[PDB]
Design a binder for this molecule. Structure first.
Ligand code: SF4
Ligand SMILES: [Mg+2]
Ligand SMILES: [Zn+2]
Ligand SMILES: [Zn+2]
Ligand SMILES: [Zn+2]
Lengths: 166, 43, 86, 46, 443, 130, 459, 58, 45
DNA sequence: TCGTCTGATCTCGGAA
DNA sequence: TTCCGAGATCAGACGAGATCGGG
RNA sequence: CCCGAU
C-alpha cells in the first residue's frame, strides 16, 4: 500500500448543491477511482483525504460546478519487497494462482523456484510435498486501449522454510 | 510561416464555437457552495 | 482502368542489383574495430547515465546496486612539431 | 423492380383539383397535368 | 541537409549517449546558442547541459566563441560529426603506414578527444604490454620515438590556443604530475592521405603498375609543402623523381621519362583539381552501373562527352532503340542525374520551343548522391539498431535451444554484414566530399 | 538506313582483340592500334553472318563511338583523312564499385522513419541479408 | 480487473498552421488512390471498388457505410486517401514562397546568401521573446532585401542571379537556366536546418521541401458528395505521364503533359489562375468563411409578414398560433414546471399549450408525441428529462429585420401567442427596425438554452 | 458537431483513436461546429494543416 | 448614419477617410494669415 | 468594371 | 572614368450591402 | 441564372 497524490477536475452536477463540496466530491471520486488500476501507479481503492480543494468554477455550458481537486488516495502497489499472505483460488499446470483475500484474484505466480518437488499435474496438486505466503516480485501492467490482465504480478516462493505449514 | 495563432477576438471564437471573451464572456463565474481546504488525516 | 487494380506493387524489383559486399578482404580489419570501439565507447567515462531511472525509483533499499603493471620510466619532452596558429 | 415515386401535394392548406389533363409530349411519354384551386379570403397580412 | 542531421543523431546515439546527442543535435539545428538558451529549448536541466557540452568540447564537436554580448555562444561544426563514421578507417591506414604502436596512438587520440603526450604514451604502455608477454615488457621509449614520427609527417596537429573566457571553466574538461599541452588528431592530413590512396588506385587500375608508383612518390614528397586547399600539388622536376623512386624499382630514367610524358598527357590529367573531378564521375558512373544496367550507363557516359547535344543524337550515338532509350533518359531525369533542359529559348511554351537538350551537371548529381549516401547510412544503422534489443536474452547465456542459437548466428551474420557495409558506402562519401570541397571557394 | 540491325551482336566482335592483349610487357612505348582495328573491320572480324559486306568507314566507325561509352579507347589523330597517328588504348575500370542494395531502390527511398516503407522492416535488406 | 480510463472533452488553445511533408501525407491516409480515372462506378448497380471513392475514404449516401469505420453517413468523419504524383509539381498555394526562397538560397549549395554577421543579426531578432505576425513578415522583406543584392555567396562562392518567374508557374534563373519542380525538390532538400528559420519557416510546422507536391492528399468523400472530377483528371494524367515514359515520345510532349499536370494540380486548388476548386470553396459570399462559418443558417426560426398591433406592450410580439406550435423550447423538468409540463403534454402537438417532443433523461430519441399515449408519457415524466413545449406566452423570442444596419435591428421580445399568421408588434418599436408595414417581413429566432434566454432578455 | 483530435501531432482522428501515430492514448474529443470541422478537413486536403493544440477547460 | 469649389462630403468622403489613402480627391488645406484684415495682403500671400 | 496598392525595371547625378 | 544608390515610370492584382420568393 | 419582395 502507498499513498498517491492525484489531481482531478471533479464535476458536481447542480442537483447536489445542498451537500458540502468536500463530501460530495468524495462521493464522486470514489465512483471515479475504485477497483481501477492506474498504469504505472497501482490499484486505486478509495479516498484518503482531500488535501487541497480549490474554487468551484461554473462553465459557460453545463451549469454544473467544476472544482479542480488535489487529493491523496490509497492505492495497492507492492514494493518488490513484500511477503504477502493470500489464498490459492486456482491451480494451473504452468503455475499456481494465489489470490489475496477478496482483494484481487489477478496475482498469478509462476512456479520454478521452490524445492525440487515442483509440478502442478492438472488434478489440482498444489506442490509435491517435501493461508499461503507470497513474494510479489515484478511490476507488470498493460495499457488496454489499442484500436477503434492489466496488473498481473509475478509471484515467487523461495526457501522460506514455512515452519508452521511445511 | 509557422503561424501559431491563439484563438481570441470574436472572428475566431465564433468560427471555433468558443464563447467569445468580449462582453458576457469577459469574466467568469464561481459557485458559492460550502467548501474549505480541509485538514488531512494523520498517517 | 488500366492501372485501377491495386497498389501498383508491394515492392518494385530492379532487374540489376548491388554488386557484392565490395572490398571483401581488407575490411575484416576495420570491421572488427567498428565493433571494438563500440564495445569501448559505450563502456567509457565519456557517456551519460539514466539518472531519470533513479528519480523514477521510489523503491530504493539496501543490498541492491541502486543503493551501492604500467612499467615505465620518467622523461619530459614537449615538442612543437605542430602548428603555431589560432 | 418497381420503386414507386408518388407525386404528393405538399402545400400547407387544402386544394381542390379542378382539371387533370392527359397527353403525350413531343417524345410521346404520357404527360399528366393537375390544376389545384384554392380560394383565400384576404385576411391579416394580405 | 536534413539527412545529414539524421546521421548526427544516429552517430552520437551509438557512441556516447542520448542527451549528449539531443543537446548535440539541437545545437546543429539552432546554431550559435548560449548555455541557458539551450537548456530552455531542449527542456534539459542545466546540470546535464554543462556535462553534455563538456563531453562535446572534449571530442571537438562543439566550438565556443563570444563576440559582442559577453555571453559565449557555443557552435557545433556539422561536418566533423560525420567523421566519426570514418573512425576505424582512420585506424587502419596508421597500421599500413606505421606499426601497431602508432596505430594505437591515433586510436586513443580519436577516442578520448584531447590528449597530452604525457597521458597517451602512458595509456599505450598499458594496452600493448598487457597483450605482449609478461616479463617481455614493451619499452615505452619506442612509443615516444614513433609518437614524434607521426608528427614529422604531420598526422597529428595541436589544439588551437584556448580562449579561456570567464564563462568557460578550465577544471571540468580534463578527466581525473605534469600539465603539458593537448592535441587532437590531424584528420585533415588523412584526407590528403586517403586521397593519396585514391589517385594511386585510380592510375594503377587504369594505366599500369609502374605509372602509379611515380604518382605515389610524387605525392609522398609533396605532403608538408601543400595543404588540402592547394588547387594542385607543388611542381617538381623529373630529376628528383629518379631520386625519390623506391628501391623495388629498376627502371631506367629515359623509359620512365617516356612514361612521365605519357602520364602527363591523358584525358585524366599532378592536377589535383582534375583528379577529383575525374574520380567523381566514375563514382557517378559506378552508381548507374549499380542501378540501371550497362545500357543506361552507356548513355550516361554520352552526356559527359557532349555538353548540350541531346535527343537528336542519343538515339543514334548509342544505337539502342528509341523506346528503350527514352525510358533511360526519363529515369535519369526523374532521379535527378540527367539534370535538365537548360537550352529552351522559345518563350513560355512547352510544346513550341528550340528543342530541350539534356545535360548532366556534375555537382547537382554530386550533392544529391552525397545526400543519398547520408540517407543510406541512416537505413544501415537503424536496422542494426533494430536487431539488437530483441536478442539480448541469449548473449548472456554464453556469458540454449537450437532455434535460440540459430537466431544468434543469423544475427551475427547480419550485423557483420551491416557494419562492413557502413564502410563501403563511407568511401563514396570522401571520394565525393573531397570533390565537393575542391569546388567550394571561400571555405 | 539499317534500323533492322543489332549492333549489340557486333559490340563483342569489336571488343575481344582488346581483352587478350598479347605482350602486356613494357619493353617499349606500346602505342596501340586503331588502324589494325580498322583493318580487322574491313576484311574480316570474328565470324558472323553479315548482310552488309560492303565496307565503308562511315558505317563501321560508329560501333567504336558506342564502345567508348562502354569504356574503350579514345581518338588520337582522326583529324587525318585516312592514315595518321590514331593512338588508342582499352581502358580497364579505374575504380572498383561503390554501391549497396539500398542504392538500387527508387520507391524505397521514401521512408524517413518507421512508416509504410520503414527500413526497420524492408524487404530489400531482408533479401540482401541471405 | 478494470483499468482506469478517462472520458473527458477539451477545448482549443491555439492553432499551429503548418504543412505535411509527403512522407507524412502517406501515413495520414488510409488508402492509395492509384486507381482508375473512372469514377469507380461499375456498369451494374454502380458500386465502388478502388477508384477515387473507395468508401474507406468516406461516405456519400446514407445506405452505404464507410469501410474503415462501421459508421454510416451520420456520425462518421472523413478519412483520408493519398495519390502519388509521378513527377513532382508546384503547389500553387505556396508558389510565391518558392520564388521567395529561391531568391534567398543559393542555387548551387542551398545556403542562404548572407555573412555570418547578418545571419547572426537576423537570428538574434528571431529569438525575441515577443514575436508577432508583423514582426515576422517584416523580416521576410528585409532578409529578401539583403539577399537580392548579392551575387556571390560566402559559403560556396558560386554565382547567383535573379529568379524571374517566367510565364505560368515556371521559373527562370539567369540561354538561361529554368528551374522545373524536379530540380527544386533536391535544392530544398539541401537547405540546412540552420537556415530553415531564416526563411521564417518555423520548422516544427514544416520544412521547405514540402512546398512542392510529390504526394497529394485527396479530400475525404464526406466533404464531396465536381472536385472529384478534378481528382480523376489527375490520375488520368498520372498514367499518361506513366505510359509515355515507357512508350517512347519526344520530350516536348512529356514536358507538356508534365506542364498539363502542373496546371491540373493547380487547377484543383484555384480555378482563376468550368469547375470551382478548393480556393473557391473558401472565398466570396458563398464560401465557408463568409457564409458558412459566420453567417450560418439557423434552426428554430421563422419568418412572416408583419402587421401592426398597438394593443401590446412595447416589449411583446404577437406570434401566430401555427408558428408557435412549431417553434419549440426545450424546457427541462425542475420541480416547478412538473405539473405545468404534465398539463401541457396531455395536449400534445395539436392544442396550442402543448408539446411535441420528449427526450428521456438519457439521450433517448425525442419521442414524437403524436402517435403514442400522451397520458402514459405524462405520468411517466420524471425529473431531469427534456420537454420541447410550444412557444408559449412569456417566452423570449428575438426579432431581426434583414437589412440589419445598427445594433437595434435584433431586439428581444417577450412572446404572446395570438390568433393570426402575422408577426404583430407595437408600432413604437418600428423605427429601430426601420420597418414599415408595407409588406415587409422580419425573422424571429428562438433561443434554446436557458443561458441564451437571459442574454436576450437582459441585454 | 462532435469531433475527436489527439493531443500530440494534433489532427482529426476518427472515433476512439487517431490513425497518424496509432498509439490511441492522446485522443481527446473536442466540441466544434461542423462547418469548422469541414474547414479543417478541406484545409488539410490542400497542404495547409491546422494542427490544433488542445487544452483542458480551466 | 452612412446608410442615411467642391468638397466631397458623403459616403465617398467617409469611405475616403476610413481607407486613409495617400492621395485623395479634393484635398484642401485651409490657412490663417498674420494680417487678416486686407484683401491685398492676402493676395500677396 | 476601373479602382486601388505593389514592386519591378530604367537614368540622370553625386561621391572617391 | 566609375557607379552605387535613388526618384520615375508600367503591370498586376482582388475588392465592391443584406436577405426572402418562385420558375 | 433570370424574375420578384423589402
Ligand atoms: S531499407 Fe529503408 S532505405 Fe534501404 S531501401 Fe528499404 S527502405 Fe529504402
Ligand atoms: Mg417597407
Ligand atoms: Zn469511418
Ligand atoms: Zn554561390
Ligand atoms: Zn495522432
Amino acid at each position: 500500500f502507498v499513498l498517491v497524490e492525484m489531481v482531478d477536475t471533479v464535476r458536481i452536477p447542480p442537483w447536489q448543491f445542498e451537500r458540502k463540496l468536500n463530501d460530495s466530491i468524495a462521493e464522486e471520486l470514489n465512483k471515479k477511482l475504485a477497483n481501477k488500476v492506474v498504469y504505472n501507479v497501482g490499484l486505486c481503492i478509495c479516498l484518503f483525504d482531500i488535501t487541497k480543494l480549490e474554487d468551484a468554477y461554473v462553465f459557460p455550458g453545463d451549469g454544473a460546478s467544476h472544482t479542480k481537486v488535489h487529493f491523496r488516495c490509497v492505492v495497492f502497489h507492492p514494493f518488490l519487497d513484500e511477503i504477502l499472505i493470500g489464498k490459492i483460488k486456482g491451480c494451473s499446470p504452468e503455475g499456481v494462482h494465489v489470490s489475496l483475500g477478496f482483494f484481487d484474484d489477478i496475482l498469478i505466480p509462476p512456479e520454478s523456484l521452490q524445492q525440487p518437488a515442483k509440478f502442478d499435474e492438472a488434478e489440482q496438486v498444489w506442490v509435491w510435498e517435501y493461508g499461503e505466503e507470497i513474494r510479489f516480485r515484478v511490476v507488470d501492467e498493460s495499457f488496454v486501449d489499442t484500436s477503434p490482465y492489466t496488473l498481473v504480478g509475478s509471484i515467487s516462493e523461495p526457501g522460506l522454510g514455512l515452519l508452521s505449514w511445511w | 510561416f509557422g503561424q501559431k495563432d491563439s484563438v481570441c477576438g470574436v472572428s475566431e471564437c465564433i468560427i471555433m464555437g468558443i464563447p467569445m471573451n468580449i462582453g458576457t464572456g469577459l469574466f467568469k463565474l464561481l459557485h458559492k457552495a460550502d467548501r474549505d481546504p480541509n485538514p488531512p488525516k494523520r498517517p | 482502368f488500366s492501372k485501377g487494380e491495386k497498389l501498383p506493387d508491394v515492392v518494385l524489383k530492379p532487374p540489376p542489383l548491388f554488386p557484392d559486399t565490395d572490398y571483401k578482404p581488407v575490411p575484416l580489419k576495420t570491421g572488427e574495430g567498428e565493433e571494438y570501439m563500440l564495445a569501448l565507447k559505450q563502456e567509457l567515462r565519456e557517456t551519460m547515465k539514466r539518472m531519470p531511472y533513479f528519480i523514477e525509483t521510489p523503491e530504493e533499499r539496501q543490498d541492491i546496486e541502486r543503493y551501492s603493471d604500467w612499467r615505465r620510466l620518467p622523461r619530459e619532452m614537449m615538442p612543437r612539431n605542430k602548428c603555431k596558429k589560432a | 423492380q418497381y420503386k414507386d415515386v408518388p407525386i404528393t401535394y405538399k402545400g400547407a392548406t387544402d386544394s381542390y383539383i379542378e382539371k387533370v389533363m392527359i397527353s403525350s409530349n413531343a417524345e410521346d411519354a404520357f404527360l399528366i397535368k393537375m390544376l389545384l384551386r384554392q380560394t383565400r379570403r384576404p385576411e391579416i397580412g394580405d | 541537409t536534413q539527412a545529414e542531421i539524421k546521421l548526427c543523431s544516429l552517430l552520437l546515439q551509438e557512441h556516447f549517449g542520448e542527451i549528449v546527442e539531443k543537446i548535440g543535435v539541437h545545437l546543429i539545428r539552432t546554431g550559435s546558442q548560449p548555455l541557458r538558451v539551450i537548456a530552455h529549448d531542449t527542456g534539459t536541466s542545466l546540470d546535464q547541459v554543462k556535462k553534455a557540452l563538456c563531453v562535446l568540447v572534449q571530442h571537438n564537436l562543439v566550438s565556443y566563441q563570444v563576440h559582442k554580448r559577453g555571453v559565449v555562444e557555443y557552435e557545433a561544426q556539422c561536418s566533423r560529426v560525420l567523421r566519426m563514421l570514418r573512425y576505424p578507417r582512420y585506424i587502419y591506414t596508421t597500421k599500413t603506414l606505421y606499426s601497431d604502436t602508432g596505430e594505437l596512438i591515433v586510436e586513443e587520440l580519436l577516442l578520448n578527444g584531447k590528449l597530452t603526450m604525457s597521458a597517451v604514451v602512458k595509456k599505450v604502455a598499458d594496452r600493448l604490454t598487457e597483450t605482449m608477454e609478461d616479463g617481455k615488457t614493451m619499452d615505452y621509449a619506442e612509443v615516444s620515438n614513433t609518437f614524434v614520427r607521426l608528427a614529422d609527417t604531420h598526422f597529428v596537429q595541436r589544439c588551437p590556443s584556448v580562449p579561456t573566457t570567464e564563462n568557460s571553466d578550465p577544471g571540468p574538461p580534463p578527466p581525473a604530475p605534469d600539465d603539458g599541452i593537448y592535441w587532437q588528431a590531424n584528420l585533415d592530413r588523412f584526407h590528403q592521405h586517403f586521397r593519396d590512396q585514391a589517385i594511386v588506385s585510380a592510375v594503377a587500375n587504369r594505366m599500369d603498375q609502374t605509372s602509379s608508383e611515380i604518382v605515389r612518390t610524387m605525392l609522398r614528397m609533396s605532403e608538408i609543402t601543400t595543404s588540402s586547399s592547394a588547387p594542385f600539388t607543388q611542381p617538381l622536376s623529373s630529376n628528383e623523381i629518379f631520386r625519390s623512386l623506391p628501391v623495388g624499382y629498376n627502371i631506367s630514367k629515359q623509359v620512365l621519362d617516356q612514361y612521365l610524358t605519357l602520364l602527363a598527357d591523358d584525358p585524366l590529367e599532378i592536377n589535383l583539381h582534375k583528379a577529383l573531378a575525374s574520380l567523381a564521375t566514375a563514382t557517378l558512373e559506378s552508381v548507374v552501373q549499380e542501378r540501371f544496367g550497362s545500357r543506361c550507363a552507356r548513355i550516361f557516359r554520352l552526356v559527359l562527352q557532349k555538353k548540350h547535344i541531346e535527343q537528336k543524337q542519343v538515339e543514334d550515338f548509342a544505337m539502342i532503340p528509341a523506346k528503350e532509350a527514352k525510358d533511360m533518359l526519363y529515369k535519369m531525369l526523374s532521379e535527378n542525374f540527367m539534370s535538365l533542359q537548360e537550352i529552351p529559348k522559345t518563350p513560355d511554351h512547352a510544346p513550341s520551343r528550340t528543342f530541350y537538350l539534356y545535360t548532366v551537371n556534375i555537382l547537382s548529381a554530386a550533392r544529391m548522391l552525397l545526400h543519398r549516401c547520408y540517407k543510406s547510412i541512416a537505413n544501415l544503422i537503424e536496422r542494426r539498431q533494430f536487431e539488437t534489443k530483441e536478442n539480448k536474452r541469449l548473449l548472456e547465456k554464453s556469458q540454449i535451444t537450437a532455434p535460440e542459437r540459430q537466431q544468434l548466428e543469423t544475427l551475427k551474420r547480419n550485423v557483420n554484414k551491416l557494419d562492413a557495409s557502413e564502410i563501403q558506402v563511407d568511401e563514396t562519401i570522401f571520394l565525393l566530399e573531397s570533390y565537393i570541397e575542391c569546388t567550394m571557394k571561400r571555405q | 538506313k539499317f534500323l533492322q540491325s543489332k549492333a549489340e551482336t557486333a559490340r563483342e566482335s569489336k571488343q575481344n582483340p582488346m581483352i587478350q592483349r598479347n605482350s602486356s610487357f613494357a619493353s617499349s612505348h606500346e602505342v596501340w592500334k586503331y588502324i589494325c582495328e580498322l583493318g580487322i573491320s574491313k576484311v574480316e572480324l570474328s565470324m558472323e553472318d553479315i548482310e552488309t559486306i560492303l565496307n565503308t568507314l562511315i558505317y563501321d566507325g560508329k560501333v567504336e563511338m558506342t564502345i567508348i561509352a562502354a569504356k574503350e579507347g579514345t581518338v588520337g589523330s582522326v583529324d587525318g583523312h585516312m592514315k595518321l597517328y590514331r593512338a588508342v588504348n582499352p581502358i580497364i575500370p579505374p575504380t572498383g564499385l561503390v554501391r549497396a542494395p539500398c542504392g538500387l531502390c527508387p520507391v524505397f527511398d521514401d521512408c524517413h522513419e518507421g512508416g509504410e516503407i520503414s527500413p526497420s522492416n524492408c524487404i530489400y535488406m531482408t533479401e540482401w541479408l541471405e | 480487473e478494470q483499468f482506469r480510463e478517462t472520458d473527458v472533452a477539451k477545448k482549443i488553445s491555439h492553432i499551429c498552421f503548418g504543412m505535411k511533408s509527403p512522407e507524412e501525407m502517406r501515413q495520414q491516409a488510409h488508402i492509395q488512390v492509384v486507381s482508375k480515372n473512372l469514377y469507380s462506378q461499375d456498369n451494374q448497380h454502380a458500386p465502388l471498388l478502388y477508384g477515387v471513392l473507395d468508401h474507406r475514404m468516406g461516405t456519400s449516401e446514407k445506405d452505404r457505410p464507410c469501410e474503415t469505420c462501421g459508421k454510416n453517413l451520420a456520425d462518421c468523419l472523413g478519412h483520408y486517401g493519398y495519390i502519388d504524383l509521378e513527377l513532382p509539381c508546384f503547389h500553387v498555394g505556396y508558389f510565391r514562397a518558392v520564388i521567395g526562397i529561391l531568391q534567398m538560397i543559393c542555387k548551387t549549395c542551398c545556403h542562404i546568401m548572407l555573412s555570418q554577421e547578418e545571419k547572426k543579426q537576423f537570428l538574434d531578432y528571431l529569438k525575441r521573446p515577443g514575436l508577432t505576425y508583423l514582426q515576422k513578415r517584416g523580416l521576410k522583406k528585409k532578409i529578401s532585401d539583403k539577399c537580392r543584392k548579392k551575387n556571390i555567396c560566402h559559403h560556396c562562392g558560386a554565382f547567383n542571379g535573379t529568379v524571374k518567374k517566367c510565364g505560368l508557374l515556371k521559373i527562370i534563373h539567369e540561354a538561361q537556366e529554368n528551374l522545373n519542380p524536379l530540380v527544386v525538390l533536391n535544392l530544398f532538400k539541401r537547405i540546412p536546418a540552420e537556415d530553415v528559420p531564416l526563411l521564417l519557416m518555423n520548422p516544427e510546422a514544416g520544412k521547405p521541401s514540402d512546398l512542392i507536391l510529390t504526394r497529394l492528399l485527396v479530400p475525404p468523400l464526406c466533404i464531396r458528395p465536381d472536385l472529384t472530377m478534378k481528382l480523376t483528371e489527375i490520375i488520368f494524367l498520372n498514367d499518361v505521364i506513366k505510359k509515355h515514359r515507357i512508350s517512347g515520345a519526344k520530350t516536348q510532349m512529356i514536358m507538356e503533359d508534365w506542364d498539363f499536370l502542373q496546371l491540373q494540380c493547380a487547377l484543383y486548388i484555384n480555378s482563376e489562375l468550368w469547375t470551382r476548386g478548393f480556393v473557391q470553396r473558401l472565398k466570396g459570399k458563398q464560401g465557408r468563411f463568409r457564409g458558412n462559418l459566420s453567417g450560418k443558417r439557423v434552426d428554430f426560426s421563422g419568418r412572416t409578414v408583419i402587421s401592426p398591433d398597438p394593443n401590446l406592450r412595447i416589449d411583446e410580439v404577437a406570434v401566430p398560433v401555427h408558428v408557435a406550435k412549431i417553434l419549440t423550447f426545450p424546457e427541462k423538468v425542475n420541480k416547478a414546471n412538473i405539473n405545468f409540463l404534465r398539463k401541457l403534454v396531455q395536449n400534445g402537438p395539436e392544442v396550442h399549450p402543448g408539446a411535441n417532443f420528449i427526450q428521456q433523461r438519457h439521450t433517448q430519441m425525442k419521442r414524437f408525441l403524436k402517435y403514442g399515449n400522451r397520458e402514459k408519457m405524462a405520468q411517466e415524466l420524471k425529473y431531469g428529462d427534456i420537454v420541447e413545449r410550444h412557444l408559449i406566452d412569456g417566452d423570449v423570442v428575438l426579432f431581426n429585420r434583414q437589412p440589419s444596419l445598427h445594433k437595434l435591428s435584433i431586439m428581444a421580445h417577450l412572446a404572446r401567442v395570438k390568433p393570426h399568421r402575422t408577426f404583430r408588434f407595437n408600432e413604437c418599436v418600428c423605427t429601430p427596425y426601420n420597418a414599415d408595414f408595407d409588406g415587409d417581413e422580419m425573422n424571429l429566432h428562438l433561443p434554446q438554452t436557458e443561458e441564451a434566454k437571459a442574454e436576450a432578455l437582459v441585454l | 458537431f462532435e469531433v475527436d483530435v489527439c493531443g500530440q501531432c494534433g489532427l482529426l482522428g476518427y472515433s476512439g483513436w487517431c490513425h497518424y501515430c496509432k498509439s490511441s492514448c492522446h485522443v481527446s474529443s473536442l466540441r466544434i461546429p461542423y462547418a469548422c470541422k469541414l474547414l479543417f478537413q478541406e484545409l488539410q486536403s490542400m497542404n495547409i494543416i491546422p494542427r490544433l493544440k488542445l487544452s483542458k477547460y480551466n | 448614419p452612412g446608410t442615411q469649389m467642391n468638397i466631397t462630403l458623403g459616403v465617398p468622403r467617409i469611405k475616403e477617410i476610413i481607407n486613409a489613402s495617400k492621395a485623395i480627391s479634393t484635398p484642401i488645406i485651409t490657412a490663417q494669415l498674420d494680417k487678416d484684415d486686407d484683401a491685398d495682403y492676402a493676395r500677396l500671400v
